[PDB]
Design a protein around this ligand. Structure first.
Ligand SMILES: [Cl-]
Ligand SMILES: [Cl-]
Ligand SMILES: [Cl-]
Ligand SMILES: [Zn+2]
Length: 302
């Protein structure tokens, strides 16, 4: 041997394989909280992550959704990489699917299966792709892939203005509360989290929403800086979306627990909560770009 910007590289993420994982998860059928499709998804993901070197842990809990009396079983899944680390990052996504495509204006269409391809599913699929590479990634931080159950187990969507409807965010609230309770006894701390939501469509506009900006200014700066360096053109230095300036999502509970957390989202996704939110709406190149931004963010941590 002889001797030969923060140091990081892109990885050979496979865009076709990433889309195939979206298709595979959607081919389960709906993965509504508390259903056999969700159980099947958990098995698929657990086997995939373990086979690529991650340690997989379940966070099992029960809740009562507002419109129901029965309890629903919920399970967050955590696939952990690099255990011997005092600082850990989170890459997260929900993975339950909404019971109905509630943006359909013909309510008969609320009785049809909602595939939710770009909504939770694509984040899980990007984690499946990233898992092929993680054991080859140099990282000064731990990395936990966290899949939240029960983000939108919405059986009653309410009436806009008149009724709030069902509750969101069971899984992220459970995870964040568990961290708050355990933190003083843990040998690590979570120093940042990136939530992936509505991010994988062709030409996505991944803009800056307010809870992310307020909760995690340096995380936003690092992620968008990495995006500039890797050429991920979807990450734009602009505020908000047509649909909303500030977006409630799974990152709220994380920020409230003191974990800076950014939502990587295009809330103007045109197939949001429509039956047309299907795997053909996913861009493999967009998935690869977001994956490379996440891996660059991981690698630049001191
Ligand atoms: Cl390690
Ligand atoms: Cl909706
Ligand atoms: Cl920050
Ligand atoms: Zn949704």
């Amino acid at each position: 041997a002889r001797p030969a910007k923060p140091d990081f590289k892109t990885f050979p993420l496979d865009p076709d394989r990433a889309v195939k994982y979206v298709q595979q998860l959607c081919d389960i059928g709906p993965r509504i909280s508390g259903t056999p499709g969700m159980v099947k998804q958990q098995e698929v993901l657990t086997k995939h992550f373990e086979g690529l070197g991650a340690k997989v842990v379940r966070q099992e809990f029960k809740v009562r959704q507002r419109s129901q009396r029965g309890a629903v079983d919920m399970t967050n899944l955590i696939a952990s990489w690099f255990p011997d680390r005092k600082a850990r990052l989170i890459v997260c996504s929900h993975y339950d699917t909404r019971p109905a495509a509630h943006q359909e204006t013909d309510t008969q269409n609320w009785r049809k299966p909602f595939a939710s391809a770009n909504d939770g599913t694509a984040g899980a699929a990007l984690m499946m792709e990233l898992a092929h590479h993680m054991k080859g990634v140099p990282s000064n931080v731990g990395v936990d892939f966290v899949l939240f159950d029960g983000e939108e187990y919405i059986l009653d969507p309410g009436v806009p203005g008149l009724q709030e409807g069902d509750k969101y965010f069971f899984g992220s609230e459970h995870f964040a509360n568990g961290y708050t309770k355990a933190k003083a006894g843990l040998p690590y701390r979570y120093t940042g989290a990136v939530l992936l939501d509505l991010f994988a469509h062709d030409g996505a506009r991944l803009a800056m929403e307010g809870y992310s900006l307020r909760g995690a200014p340096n995380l936003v700066a690092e992620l968008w800086r990495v995006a500039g360096w890797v050429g991920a053109k979807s990450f734009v230095n602009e505020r908000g979306f047509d649909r909303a300036t500030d977006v409630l999502d799974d990152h709220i509970a994380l920020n409230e627990a003191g974990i800076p957390a950014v939502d990587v989202i295009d809330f103007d996704y045109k197939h949001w909560h429509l039956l047309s939110d299907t795997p053909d709406k996913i861009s493999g190149k967009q998935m690869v770009d977001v994956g490379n931004v996440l891996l660059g963010w991981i690698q630049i941590q001191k």
